[PDB]
Amino acid sequence: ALFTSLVGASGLGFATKFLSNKIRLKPAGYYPLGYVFSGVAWAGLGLVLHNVHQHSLEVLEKKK
Amino acid sequence: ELKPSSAIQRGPLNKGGWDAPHALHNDGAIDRYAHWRTFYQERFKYTRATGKSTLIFLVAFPALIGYVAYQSEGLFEFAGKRRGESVTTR
Amino acid sequence: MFLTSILLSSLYLFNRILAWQGNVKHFYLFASNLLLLFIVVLYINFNTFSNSFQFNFELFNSLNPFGLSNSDISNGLLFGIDGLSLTFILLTVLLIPLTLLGNWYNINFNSNLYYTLVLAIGLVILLNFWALDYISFYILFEATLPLLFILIHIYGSSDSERASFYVLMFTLSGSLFMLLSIVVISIVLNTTNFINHNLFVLSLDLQTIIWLGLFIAIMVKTPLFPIHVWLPVVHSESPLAGSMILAGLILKLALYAILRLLLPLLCEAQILYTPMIYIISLLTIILTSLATLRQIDLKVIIAYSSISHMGIAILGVCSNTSLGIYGSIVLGVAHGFVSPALFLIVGGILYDRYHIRIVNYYKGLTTYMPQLATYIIILSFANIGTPLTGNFTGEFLSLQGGFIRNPIIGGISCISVLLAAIYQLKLTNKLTGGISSIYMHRTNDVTIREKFIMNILIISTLIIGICPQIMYNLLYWTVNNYIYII
Amino acid sequence: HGPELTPAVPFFQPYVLKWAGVSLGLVAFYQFNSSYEAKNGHTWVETFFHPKSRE
Numbered sequence: 129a130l131f132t133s134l135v136g137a138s139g140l141g142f143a144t145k146f147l148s149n150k151i152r153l154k155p156a157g158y159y160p161l162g163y164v165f166s167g168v169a170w171a172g173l174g175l176v177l178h179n180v181h182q183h184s185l186e187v188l189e190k191k192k
Numbered sequence: 193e194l195k196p197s198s199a200i201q202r203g204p205l206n207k208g209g210w211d212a213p214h215a216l217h218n219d220g221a222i223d224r225y226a227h228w229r230t231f232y233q234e235r236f237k238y239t240r241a242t243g244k245s246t247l248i249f250l251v252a253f254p255a256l257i258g259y260v261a262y263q264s265e266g267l268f269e270f271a272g273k274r275r276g277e278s279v280t281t282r
Numbered sequence: 283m284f285l286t287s288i289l290l291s292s293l294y295l296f297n298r299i300l301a302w303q304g305n306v307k308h309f310y311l312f313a314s315n316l317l318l319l320f321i322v323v324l325y326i327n328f329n330t331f332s333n334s335f336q337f338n339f340e341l342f343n344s345l346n347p348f349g350l351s352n353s354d355i356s357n358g359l360l361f362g363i364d365g366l367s368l369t370f371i372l373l374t375v376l377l378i379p380l381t382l383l384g385n386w387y388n389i390n391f392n393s394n395l396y397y398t399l400v401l402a403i404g405l406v407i408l409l410n411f412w413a414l415d416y417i418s419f420y421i422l423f424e425a426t427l428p429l430l431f432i433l434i435h436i437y438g439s440s441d442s443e444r445a446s447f448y449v450l451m452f453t454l455s456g457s458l459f460m461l462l463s464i465v466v467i468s469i470v471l472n473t474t475n476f477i478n479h480n481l482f483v484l485s486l487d488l489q490t491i492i493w494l495g496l497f498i499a500i501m502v503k504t505p506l507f508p509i510h511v512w513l514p515v516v517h518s519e520s521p522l523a524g525s526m527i528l529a530g531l532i533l534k535l536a537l538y539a540i541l542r543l544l545l546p547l548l549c550e551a552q553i554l555y556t557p558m559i560y561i562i563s564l565l566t567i568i569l570t571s572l573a574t575l576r577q578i579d580l581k582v583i584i585a586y587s588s589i590s591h592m593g594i595a596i597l598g599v600c601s602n603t604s605l606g607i608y609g610s611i612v613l614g615v616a617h618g619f620v621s622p623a624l625f626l627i628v629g630g631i632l633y634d635r636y637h638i639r640i641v642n643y644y645k646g647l648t649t650y651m652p653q654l655a656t657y658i659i660i661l662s663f664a665n666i667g668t669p670l671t672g673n674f675t676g677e678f679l680s681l682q683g684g685f686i687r688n689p690i691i692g693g694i695s696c697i698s699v700l701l702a703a704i705y706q707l708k709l710t711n712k713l714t715g716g717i718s719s720i721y722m723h724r725t726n727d728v729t730i731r732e733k734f735i736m737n738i739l740i741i742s743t744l745i746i747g748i749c750p751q752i753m754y755n756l757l758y759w760t761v762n763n764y765i766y767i768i
Numbered sequence: 769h770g771p772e773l774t775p776a777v778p779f780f781q782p783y784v785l786k787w788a789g790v791s792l793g794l795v796a797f798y799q800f801n802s803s804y805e806a807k808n809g810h811t812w813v814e815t816f817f818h819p820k821s822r823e
């Protein structure tokens with residue numbers, strides 16, 4: 129499914145923003161729009177990798 | 193001219209909590225005895241006694257169990273039994 | 283969308299209990315306690331009539347990396363149970379709130395670190411027993427070791443540096459050879475799987491030399507004779523939780539892994555080579571239960587006790603007979619009860635009161651702690667293998683199964699009842715008797731939580747000791763799934 | 769001749785109540801389920817057992 133593959137990469141993005149706050153000795157929610165930025169960015173990476181895998185599967189289907 | 197910054201104010205570390213009073217008087221002789229026994233391996237050396245024990249329990253005793261275990265392998269079949277029947281296989 | 287919403291709610295509830303409350307001892311207890319309510323309801327819906335694996339799920343499939351998958355092509359990580367796999371989960375989940383409880387009034391410095399590490403190395407050994415590939419069994423066979431390293435290094439007693447290095451080094455050093463033998467049968471069979479490998483035979487020259495890589499890998503984990511270097515000196519400097527979860531859970535894992543990995547695809551490589559397993563198991567029972575006698579430290583004795591019982595257990599597995607398999611399982615479920623109770627006695631209660639673990643200070647425990655000297659005696663006499671305790675049912679059936687396969691090695695190995703009585707009763711009558719010691723101010727009686735743990739770990743031995751059949755409903759397929767006597 | 773009496777102690781201490789209550793509750797539960805040999809033909813808690821069929 130495409131949707132869980134977006135939500136998981138967005139969760140990886142929330143983890144990036146969280147851990148980057150915690151290295152800088154900030155609290156958890158410091159700049160809470162930055163979670164939206166990282167979620168959209170890593171979710172877009174999930175879009176890209178999802179579509180590349182789709183097209184690769186279709187190329188394998190056409191070889192029969 | 194290279195010093196960590198003036199903006200640190202770093203302090204001392206406590207572990208926090210309650211000073212429990214001493215329920216045990218430590219004995220210096222027993223303490224140094226036990227510290228000698230646990231870290232015994234840092235001062236162990238090979239002598240004739242050490243070599244005799246290492247020859248028996250590492251070499252001769254596994255070889256004796258090896259002889260007994262690999263020779264007497266499928267001999268005994270004590271499942272039912274009768275009188276006069278074969279007790280072994282070989 | 284629904285199961286995502288459950289997670290988005292539960293992480294928020296966790297966040298707010300982090301915010302208002304300071305510790306998450308209460309929410310870790312609540313979560314690890316709800317794990318029981320979950321796994322018992324999984325036990326209710328368990329069909330016992332089928333050898334089959336009931337509850338199956340793949341994680342990390344190609345078509346769905348973040349979650350479940352239903353495809354005709356599977357390269358993820360399989361998970362499931364039957365029987366065997368389920369008794370050890372039920373061993374686990376009723377013990378992890380007791381180690382999570384076990385350091386309640388103790389920690390005082392970075393408690394949120396400690397209970398996170400303990401709960402995490404308990405969840406990883408849940409999913410050990412759920413796993414079904416050779417790699418998904420192996421990627422959690424050492425996800426423990428990081429958190430075990432840091433749980434021993436910080437929070438270890440004194441000289442915890444060396445113990446933390448040993449729990450990484452020895453386990454890793456024996457574990458890489460397991461990785462070799464997994465790589466070889468993943469490039470020969472092209473399947474990592476616990477379902478199909480009954481079907482696949484191998485050449486005896488191939489099957490011979492991949493059994494080595496798994497056997498000297500479980501020689502480290504259940505510490506057999508050229509190993510058990512590390513076992514007492516990882517115990518003796520561990521904290522309280524990481525000693526209970528070590529000796530009750532990490533040791534029985536290789537008892538589970540000699541069943542799950544070795545016996546059903548190494549069927550013909552073992553019958554040539556069981557009488558090396560009998561050599562090694564006997565001279566761990568003869569040797570390591572004889573070095574217990576001369577021990578100045580008090581936690582090291584219960585460590586070598588764990589070695590001696592795990593050396594009895596793997597000559598019940600490797601019997602290729604039907605009583606020994608069930609006997610080793612009931613050893614693994616009963617030693618995992620009686621042994622962490624003993625670690626609560628040695629470094630649990632007595633090290634909290636007097637902070638030094640030398641034996642020579644400790645006598646006359648009866649005159650000021652009567653209702654601890656009772657827990658000394660009934661729990662020791664449970665470790666020796668008095669009947670009606672569940673340790674004797676296992677010791678009896680495993681010595682009987684090892685008597686079938688080779689009777690001379692069983693006759694020699696029967697002396698373990700004596701050798702396990704010697705050191706345990708020598709410790710018990712040094713601690714219990716005599717005039718109350720000079721060095722020792724009188725401290726508190728054993729408190730409500732350190733009785734609440736103990737009576738659970740005592741009733742759970744006595745129920746198995748009065749009826750070992752309460753878990754025959756699970757195991758009666760796995761008594762048969764591993765016999766190759768044609 | 770007096771045996772030198774010790775202060776007065778209640779009988780039903782909390783462990784008496786807890787241990788006896790759980791033991792007698794489990795015994796009553798076992799007899800309650802064994803009373804369904806003719807009333808239903810199977811035990812009560814077997815009605816909560818719903819595994820999947822083997823097929």
Ligand SMILES: CCCCCCCCCCCCCCCCCC(=O)OC[C@H](COP(=O)(O)OCCN)OC(=O)CCCCCCCCCCCCCCCCC
Binds near residue numbers: 350408412421425
């Ligand atoms: C370190 C790398 C290792 C891999 C990463 C670690 C694993 C991450 C956690 C994922 C694994 C467990 C959670 C998700 C799988 C189980 C829950 C689930 O949604 O599936 C239901 C499960 C099986 O699925 P199924 O029976 O086929 O029904 C689904 C029908 N659509 O039906 C069942 O039978 C339930 C089985 C659940 C028991 C799972 C084992 C219990 C231990 C849970 C540990 C989870 C750790 C999470 C830590 C949280 C930290 C934020």
